[PDB]
Design a protein around this ligand. Structure first.
Ligand SMILES: *[C@@H]1O[C@H](CO)[C@@H](O[C@@H]2O[C@H](CO)[C@@H](O[C@@H]3O[C@H](CO)[C@@H](O)[C@H](O)[C@@H]3O)[C@H](O)[C@H]2NC(C)=O)[C@H](O)[C@H]1NC(C)=O
Ligand SMILES: *[C@@H]1O[C@H](CO)[C@@H](O[C@@H]2O[C@H](CO)[C@@H](O[C@@H]3O[C@H](CO)[C@@H](O)[C@H](O)[C@@H]3O)[C@H](O)[C@H]2NC(C)=O)[C@H](O)[C@H]1NC(C)=O
Ligand SMILES: *[C@@H]1O[C@H](CO)[C@@H](O[C@@H]2O[C@H](CO)[C@@H](O[C@@H]3O[C@H](CO)[C@@H](O)[C@H](O)[C@@H]3O)[C@H](O)[C@H]2NC(C)=O)[C@H](O)[C@H]1NC(C)=O
Ligand SMILES: *[C@@H]1O[C@H](CO)[C@@H](O[C@@H]2O[C@H](CO)[C@@H](O[C@@H]3O[C@H](CO)[C@@H](O)[C@H](O)[C@@H]3O)[C@H](O)[C@H]2NC(C)=O)[C@H](O)[C@H]1NC(C)=O
Ligand SMILES: *[C@@H]1O[C@H](CO)[C@@H](O[C@@H]2O[C@H](CO)[C@@H](O)[C@H](O)[C@H]2NC(C)=O)[C@H](O)[C@H]1NC(C)=O
Ligand SMILES: *[C@@H]1O[C@H](CO)[C@@H](O[C@@H]2O[C@H](CO)[C@@H](O)[C@H](O)[C@H]2NC(C)=O)[C@H](O)[C@H]1NC(C)=O
Ligand SMILES: *[C@@H]1O[C@H](CO)[C@@H](O[C@@H]2O[C@H](CO)[C@@H](O)[C@H](O)[C@H]2NC(C)=O)[C@H](O)[C@H]1NC(C)=O
Ligand SMILES: *[C@@H]1O[C@H](CO)[C@@H](O[C@@H]2O[C@H](CO)[C@@H](O)[C@H](O)[C@H]2NC(C)=O)[C@H](O)[C@H]1NC(C)=O
Ligand code: NAG
Ligand code: NAG
Ligand code: NAG
Ligand code: NAG
Ligand code: CA
Ligand code: CA
Ligand code: CA
Ligand code: CA
Lengths: 390, 390, 390, 390
């Protein structure tokens, strides 16, 4: 029962919300675990939310200082999709401050990167048993996707990066079988820098839309052949820029070089589904800040430098905070002939953006799946009144 | 193992309480989720309470404002029947502000209606996977039963309404198979307006007792043939009025036209079991307010304009608040030769009725099943001391 | 896989603690459910604690007034044995203020008595489905064991009582199959009054040690043949008195008449294991108050008027509160050739006895099983500091 | 499916963290159970943390006085590995103040020692059913490992001790089958005193590294043949001392006699893996206090008096508290050809060491597994700010 990527993406005309944990709202009183860098991953038995906890809850004095990204008190938890995370409903999967996870159809592989910045090590699990470790190869924050990896025929592909965040680093494409590395490739192609890939599978291939944190306001793309276990990379061709921060959209994009001009923040994790006319990219509404979120239908964004937005759907309005976003698919819906594209938006509350109200930072989550038919509208922000926490 | 509606209703002489969550009482200190519009639905593995949460608990500053019916922070939860809802024991099923759910004997279908009032969309799930979406067709609050739907031979029937609440609207009878629409019927019959149907199955048919929110203090009834997948509608014939608000009972009712005179509130969700002499209707004791609850045995209420109350059983006394009520049956009790009629009463505490004490509104729940033999008596109100919350 | 009572009691030389929930201690801060009248019942999959909740937790303003025995906000919960009861780990089984439960080897039967004092009704469940109801027959607090019933060859025997607590009442011995009454017997024998029987099975028979609340400080005994479904009753023969309150022990007891002289309280639920020389009775250390608890080995207590205490084991010292006590056995330990006698002690804290400290009453629990070999010693009281709650 | 110890230890070059419950941090607000003497034990279905609870949570007035080691309110809980212990996720296994537990591949055996110091009794369970009891044989605190026992071919070996803590006591090696004692051996060999053995299995043998609390700063070792069910004992040969407190390391150790000079505390539970060149011992960084923790690779520490540290890995820095430590292995990882050595460190917060801040004592936990390949670095202390609790 190894998953075989034998389906194409469903056509998508709009997006509906399938889950929203309202974690910060509940967290005003209930013991909600402080998290960030969340994602969603499915398997034959259902779907779960994944997130890096901070070893504390929100209404807890230890929530002070949770703006920090790497501590010894972080780890990966999974909780039932739609539920906010508390101790009672959360599985503590591994220890670390960077992660990915995916199910090959038989067992789940999970990865936590832990340790000091200059001497970190990835811990790899298969079926909840430690199977391998991978030491840092560049000596500067070994790190991975912060969203689910993708499997085919027993092999799961994972993108990892080690080295400087602001200049040339060392990215590797890793192929796993039962939590053991069976092949590695140093990054190839024209992508200058790779961070936090959001991946999805389709017809024996995996496509990753990533984050250039060095030079690019256009997102790098990695293309993987899962039968040959080979990859290449480039940038999205469209002049419509989907990283944050970003300059204004160009009439003509660049398939092979990063587009510079990024006023402030070097990047944010994002995603995209590349399928000719059925192509959709996500992006924060603000080109400066992690606020708002919109889905853009941009036909041939992955092949056409002159491609343009043809449809748009607001998910979170610009008066509300967003954050990371990534792709996921239920690959085990045997009742559908295609893979329905889904995604999540991390809704970051607290610091740095709300530093005058609270001393913590944490997120809630909203998850969306595609519809082949025109749907309605609505905005789905975090929903908490931050002043309640002050 | 598709459910076949091959049984008649059990004879009922009285009602006993099978579950009572005492949610508001517990909610004085424990983290009870704020809910409204609850119901009960069973399947081969047991029965669960369903309810629309408000994305907060009661002892939480976000409980302020929960009188509101439609927000982006609402969704459907199921919790074990008899237990009050907390995060730890609640399944967050979908996002939205109107719902129904039912099990066909193999998989459960659930529906959440979400989005803005003028552009809402129903999200339909089967076995917890998103299967279809249904966009608003009238552009005014697409909405459904707020109690369980009913299945037969793999097909589940759902009543939905879109349009004005106070005048003519557009009601459709929807037939689902594995969460896919296989047939739709625009409302037929003499029912002028349809809201919040409470349905039950019997001998390959489904009977729905609904809420006219436009003109009628007498409840509309929908009759469905589940083999032919056709319906018609009318009103209850009895002059005994079971909506709220309502004028006094008439000596002669009207099978085909609504009975007007409703002093205040246009309606409340209610239910009834129509079975000749074995006919029972529920109603609030007050004809003005959602307070008290009584079961009335009214022989041939569905066929006889001159039908009268012959027996009565107080469930909640008139000094205590009630609310919505609806039907449910355990269709998988293979040890009984008949379907035993059951129902729930929503026990609404807080606003608007207790606005001087608290800023929230939420409910607890009591559930009753029939007995073929004379039973005892007792009143089962919410039980909380509202001033404890002030 | 119906349970067959085909084993004799194990020999018992001493008692060891197998579970202690420390519910009141935990309840100083955690949301522990207010309970009383607890017991323990096993089945093929494990053992659980059962108790009548009060529809509130201890650190909750609704805990005020929980000295009351019968409200509409009570019900039966089961929780894993050894754990204190909270919402997250508790199964809410039925609604009512008196109960019993037992597993026949295939399904569990449970009973809750609910309603007003003058018009109460027992709700009977089998495999969590409502199967029958039993209306009051005497019109004064229909009531049952408050500990587990016992099954043999698909038939479960239950002792119930209806009528005056202080004079002649109407006790019936009920035989159930799959939650349906298949035989009833009005009380027979010389037992004058029967309350709260503690029963256990052995070699196709069930023995119940009960509570005379009218005249007797000696405990009535009911003897049942489970194949013939017939019973008789008498009193324990020993002059050692095991009810509370009680006068001093007599040198000669009375097998057929109650022994009077009870200074204050008319009775307390208790238990005993009758097995010739292997005979053990439990009793509060105080003959006036529900404080302390001791196990007494009294050879032939059930047949010999001159029988005497030969061994003693303190379970709870006299400086600590006890309460109800009852029997249970793991009838599904296929690895043992005999049935090992077990029991529980209800450890009542709060009112009336601690009325100057707190406004509530609730219990914790300690459970003991026998050992055929001499064991050690230790006292196992509730353990809470009541002043912490003031 | 009885476990057969048919594998050797994996080679270990370094250690990675597989779990960290952050219990004290969470316990600032969430209802974390007060514990001490924790360990980890696995079985075919996963791994769980085990610990002796104190019958209270941290933010509970009953946490005052939890420095005490033996009360009637202690017991064993198991919780999912990686999670901090709360009531909702914890299994209350038995009552007592000393314990061990292990799975034979078919059922789990667990042991709790309970009762008064001069008359204690071990309660033995198999598959959660009480199977045997073992009365004290020396009359002074009957006690056992405080970490998992080890099974082979249906037989599980347990080390127990009864008598004086500061002079000659009576240690027995117990062999269990399905929770029944099938063989016992009085301690043999040159080990003068035995406390709190940390055991692991390999090639039909079990090796225990223990605690001499009488004379030795070098740790006693017990060697068991699981087929013959015979043992012997000695000391570690290395002059590198791994108990606490301890004098400085000697150039030459003693395989057969304890090394004295211990300035203060008579001992702490510790562990070691003895495998020639692949030999690793754990130890607190401080030779006086339970602070810090390091793993030392000491080739032939078990056979060579002149053996020396060749590699070192800091787990918890010396500015942070540690405590007990013990071994565990996942014996059911059929995908690995060897048994991977794992261990846990008890991270004790509160009294006596932090008596000026808080009135309680409790621990959090960190668990490590070996890697055959060089790994990174990082310190994993408890992480709580003790002043938050004051
Ligand atoms: C959350 O944590 C931060 C950081 O610990 C807390 O802010 C800090 O508050 C302390 C006072 O308790 C400040 O200490 C002072 O620092 C100055 C130098 O800046 C020194 O001269 C004083 O003698 C004193 O030690 C500290 O500056 C301040 N840190 C920052 C970055 O502002 C904060 O109070 C915590 N929040 C809560 C709710 O506890
Ligand atoms: C629950 O939410 C309601 C609504 O926010 C709270 O009531 C509101 O309280 C604020 C004061 O904090 C009032 O604001 C004032 O409004 C007047 C105009 O009406 C303006 O002139 C003042 O300068 C001030 O802004 C507001 O009127 C009031 N709203 C209503 C409808 O009464 C309520 O306090 C909240 N409850 C709790 C317990 O927090
Ligand atoms: C727990 O509940 C009891 C009962 O409600 C509370 O005791 C009661 O306290 C009220 C005051 O709030 C007393 O009311 C007074 O009654 C006298 C007549 O006795 C009347 O003349 C006064 O005008 C006033 O209404 C009431 O007597 C008293 N009941 C008893 C039996 O003492 C108690 O305060 C509650 N505990 C907590 C912690 O809230
Ligand atoms: C945690 O428990 C300890 C022990 O009960 C508490 O410390 C104790 O505090 C009481 C006062 O409430 C002290 O009682 C006094 O004892 C002296 C003799 O030493 C006597 O002359 C006085 O009349 C009074 O009874 C007691 O000494 C003290 N015990 C110790 C060992 O210091 C402590 O307060 C508790 N912590 C909390 C937060 O409640
Ligand atoms: C899916 O994976 C299996 C296992 O690797 C592949 O089967 C192997 O194919 C290689 C050639 O590439 C053979 O040398 C092996 O003998 C095969 N192993 C087994 C167990 O049959 C299979 O080809 C893969 N599928 C695809 C489409 O590449
Ligand atoms: C229950 O549902 C099944 C599936 O639709 C029905 O069987 C079908 O009947 C139609 C005619 O109405 C045939 O054309 C199909 O070939 C049948 N399908 C199968 C798979 O047999 C069945 O008739 C329904 N039962 C009732 C009483 O209507
Ligand atoms: C256990 O219960 C079964 C079911 O009642 C008993 O079997 C029945 O015995 C009666 C006579 O007493 C027969 O008339 C029935 O035909 C039997 N039923 C079946 C299904 O075989 C059985 O005898 C009981 N065991 C004991 C020891 O009394
Ligand atoms: C594993 O345990 C079994 C059960 O004790 C051993 O099999 C027994 O061996 C003894 C001799 O030592 C025989 O007398 C018994 O007849 C055997 N019992 C069974 C059920 O076969 C087995 O030898 C043990 N394995 C090892 C390696 O010692
Ligand atoms: C409903 O929302 C969609 C966005 O999903 C939008 O394109 C459409 O125009 C809206 N329909 C109406 C009638 O406003
Ligand atoms: C018991 O209650 C029922 C209602 O279910 C009522 O009809 C009946 O008269 C009552 N019986 C008595 C004796 O009061
Ligand atoms: C141990 O306790 C038992 C009670 O179970 C008692 O009978 C026995 O005398 C005690 N033994 C000692 C040595 O005190
Ligand atoms: C990484 O940590 C290990 C300890 O596990 C240490 O031996 C090694 O020298 C470190 N590597 C670097 C590059 O600091
Ligand atoms: Ca960038
Ligand atoms: Ca109406
Ligand atoms: Ca009596
Ligand atoms: Ca020592």
């Amino acid at each position: 029962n190894y998953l075989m990527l034998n389906k194409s993406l469903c056509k998508v005309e709009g997006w509906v919300v399938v889950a929203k944990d309202n974690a910060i709202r509940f967290g005003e009183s209930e013991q909600i675990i402080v998290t960030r860098e969340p994602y969603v991953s499915c398997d034959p038995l259902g779907c779960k939310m994944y997130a890096l906890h901070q070893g504390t809850t929100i209404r807890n004095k230890h929530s002070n200082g949770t703006i920090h990204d790497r501590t010894a008190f972080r780890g990966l938890i999974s909780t039932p999709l739609g539920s906010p995370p508390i101790v009672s409903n959360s599985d503590f999967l591994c220890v670390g401050w960077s992660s990915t996870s995916c199910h090959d159809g038989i067992g789940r592989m999970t990865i936590c990167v832990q340790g000091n910045n200059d001497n970190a090590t990835a811990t790899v699990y298969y079926d909840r048993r430690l199977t391998t470790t991978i030491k840092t190869w560049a000596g500067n924050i070994l790190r991975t996707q912060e969203s689910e990896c993708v499997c085919h025929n027993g092999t799961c592909v994972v993108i990892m990066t080690d080295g400087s965040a602001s200049s040339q680093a060392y990215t590797k494409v890793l192929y796993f079988h039962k939590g053991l590395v069976i092949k590695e490739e140093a990054l190839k192609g024209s992508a200058r820098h790779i961070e936090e890939c959001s991946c999805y599978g389709h017809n024996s291939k995996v496509t990753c839309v990533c984050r250039d944190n060095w030079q690019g306001a256009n997102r790098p793309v990695i293309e993987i052949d899962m039968n040959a276990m080979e990859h290449t990379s480039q940038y999205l061709c469209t002049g419509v820029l989907t990283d944050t921060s970003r300059p204004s959209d160009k009439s003509i994009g660049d398939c092979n070089n990063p587009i510079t001009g990024s006023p402030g923040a070097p990047g944010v994790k994002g995603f995209g589904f590349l399928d000719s006319g059925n192509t959709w990219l996500g992006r924060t509404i603000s080109p400066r800040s992690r606020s708002g979120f919109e889905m853009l239908k941009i036909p041939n964004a992955g092949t056409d430098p002159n491609s343009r937005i043809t449809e748009r759907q607001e998910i979170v309005d610009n008066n509300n905070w967003s954050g990371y976003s990534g792709s996921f698919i239920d690959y085990w819906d045997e009742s559908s002939e295609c893979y329905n594209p889904c995604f999540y938006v991390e809704l970051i509350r607290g610091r740095p953006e709300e530093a005058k109200y609270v001393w913590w930072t944490s997120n809630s989550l909203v998850a969306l799946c595609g519809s082949p038919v025109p749907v309605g509208s609505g905005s789905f922000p975090d929903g908490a009144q931050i002043q309640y926490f002050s």
